[PDB]
């Protein structure tokens, strides 16, 4: 199948690559018990104004993200970095919820890389944002026939706004050469305008409620982790493992690595996680890959015989994962199916480091 032919000539062929299959799966999560209060974020009486957008810190609880669809009818669920259906598998350190009310034609300003009025003066998102933006129409809750003036937004500011900064100052913006001295007038504007938010307005000018879930990636020990039960710890066996949302396959051993107390992961030259800290017992576990290697086939021509010797490259002959009669140990690895002989001939089929094979199949 490798040579794509029905007739094989005499020689050694690099055919396969063997690998030890994983035995079982291990999940390891911190033993937190509380539930994250997303109901207080979403199901509220009223939301704060955008220039005073409200920030709530969510930590030390189990977060279920499939319950959010129940108590809020949203359609704008734009998630950057993390897919919203994968929020329950992996888990973060700390969550932040930024709640405000914005007009329907400005929801597109709540995105990384966007500038405008609100994205430059009221609420700015970083370009490396890892989070979700949730928006829903709230015309029936924020629309008054006499005009709702309880929602205010900044229109004038001397400079742009750095990401995740609140500016609730009320100083008069000076648009002229003369100083305002705290008195508004010509070229002296109050920088805090207010929306109308009438129910008779067309859609796109109707009020909308926005909750931005800002996620903090795994650098500290994790405090917010969703529903996934943690299994028992298995060492010295090739298993699949899950550590706070980090998935891998390998052998977990005890390590004498000296982690400083602020560290959680330990990395390699090729930017692969090879050392972990157990979130339930603070054990310094080392990750090695499972046993693998190359499989070469030493055969004569199929016109002569159909007998096959197998060379496992690199492994020791005690490392071969059986379930053999003739087993020989060469510097190239383990030779199975070829009987070693004490004689010496010319090299027919080369193997490596002075060992050759020839047609039973003998190795000399």
């Amino acid at each position: 199948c490798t040579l794509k032919s029905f007739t094989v000539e005499k020689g050694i062929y690099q055919t396969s690559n063997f690998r030890v299959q994983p035995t079982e799966s291990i999940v390891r999560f911190p033993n937190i018990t509380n539930l994250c209060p997303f109901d207080e974020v979403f199901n509220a009486t009223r939301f704060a104004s955008v220039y005073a957008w409200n920030r709530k810190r969510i930590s030390n609880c189990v977060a279920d993200y499939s319950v959010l669809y129940n108590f809020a009818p949203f359609f704008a669920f734009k998630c950057y970095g993390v897919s919203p259906t994968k929020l329950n598998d992996l888990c973060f350190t700390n969550v932040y919820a930024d709640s405000f009310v914005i007009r329907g034609n400005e929801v597109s300003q709540i995105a990384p890389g966007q500038t405008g009025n609100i994205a430059d003066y009221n609420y700015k998102l970083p370009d490396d944002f890892t989070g979700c933006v949730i928006a829903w129409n709230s015309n029936k809750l924020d629309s008054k026939v006499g005009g709702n003036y309880n929602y205010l937004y900044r229109l004038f500011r001397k400079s742009n706004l750095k990401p995740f900064e609140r500016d609730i100052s009320t100083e008069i913006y000076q648009a002229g050469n003369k100083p305002c001295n705290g008195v508004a007038g010509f070229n002296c504007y109050f920088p805090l305008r207010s929306y109308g938010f009438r129910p008779t307005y067309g859609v796109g000018h109707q009020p909308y409620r926005v909750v931005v879930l800002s996620f903090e990636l795994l650098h500290a020990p994790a405090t917010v982790c969703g529903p996934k039960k943690s299994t028992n710890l298995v060492k010295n066996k090739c298993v699949n493992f899950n550590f706070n949302g980090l998935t891998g396959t390998g052998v977990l051993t005890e390590s004498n690595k000296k982690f400083l107390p602020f560290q959680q992961f330990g990395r390699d030259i090729a930017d692969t996680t090879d050392a972990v800290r157990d979130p339930q017992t603070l054990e310094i576990l080392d990750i090695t890959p499972c046993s693998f290697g190359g499989v070469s086939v030493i055969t004569p021509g199929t016109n002569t015989s159909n007998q096959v010797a197998v060379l496992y490259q690199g492994v020791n002959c005690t490392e071969v994962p059986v379930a053999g009669s003739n087993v020989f140990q060469t510097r190239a690895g383990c030779l199975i199916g070829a009987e070693y002989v004490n004689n010496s001939y010319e090299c027919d089929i080369p193997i490596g480091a002075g060992i050759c094979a020839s047609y039973s199949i003998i190795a000399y």
Binding site: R57, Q263, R267
Partner: protein, 231 residues
């Protein structure tokens, strides 16, 4: 009540850029670092008696603070832009068994001090960090990136007795705060014989050397000279 001197910094102010263990590797990073052999400023604050001007300094993208005082004259810091009840003002106070961090808009006088035995969108009460009671040099790094206040700390005893000594000392990360404040000026707090060193961070690329035990024992500043650029 204020005396300014200028001195060298040598190779000081190196901190861990992340919480990832690396052992026996040469890692290239780019962050707000204190440049090598920079010009740090020595401040002497002297009061007329041991009872019960404009010394406000600019922030300028991170501050490396250093102190060799045995007693706890230095108690905390004030960060902000205007600091006259017109905007948010970060206040860090170090108690004997507590640390308090606020962003309350209430202002103080032009000469702030902590008397003996003496709206707010963020509040942070925690275990304090000033246990370093040789000369017991204390180094701190404050920076503000993307609405996050990062405080790095280190406490190393020194024996040379000549200002900031030669050698390397990595600063471990201590405090991260999601306060989200504009900072351009800062000041210190006193309980007078205080003496402290101030340096300013710049965006620099460093090459850090992680040894067998995963400690940053050596570093190279890439923009110092062509030899280190070649390195």
């Amino acid at each position: 009540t204020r005396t300014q001197s200028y001195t060298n910094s040598f190779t000081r102010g190196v901190y861990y850029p992340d919480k990832v263990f690396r052992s026996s590797v040469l890692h290239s990073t780019q962050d707000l670092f204190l440049p090598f052999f920079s010009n740090v400023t020595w401040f002497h604050a002297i009061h007329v008696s041991g009872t019960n001007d404009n010394p406000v300094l600019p922030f300028n993208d991170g501050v490396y603070f250093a102190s060799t005082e045995k007693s706890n004259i230095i108690r905390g810091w004030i960060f902000g832009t205007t600091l006259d009840s017109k905007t948010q003002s970060l206040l860090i106070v170090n108690n004997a068994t507590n640390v308090v961090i606020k962003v309350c808009e209430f202002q103080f006088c032009n000469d702030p001090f902590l008397d003996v035995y003496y709206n707010c969108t963020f509040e942070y009460v925690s275990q304090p960090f000033l246990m370093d009671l040789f000369k017991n040099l204390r180094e701190f790094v404050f920076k503000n990136i993307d609405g996050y206040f990062k405080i790095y700390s280190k406490h190393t005893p020194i024996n040379l007795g000549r200002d900031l000594p030669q050698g390397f000392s990595a600063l471990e990360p201590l405090v991260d705060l999601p306060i989200g404040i504009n900072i351009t000026r800062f000041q210190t707090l006193l309980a007078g014989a205080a003496a402290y060193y101030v340096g300013y961070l710049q965006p620099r690329t460093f090459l850090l050397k992680y040894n067998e035990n995963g400690t940053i024992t050596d570093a190279v500043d890439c923009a110092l000279d062509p030899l280190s650029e070649t390195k």
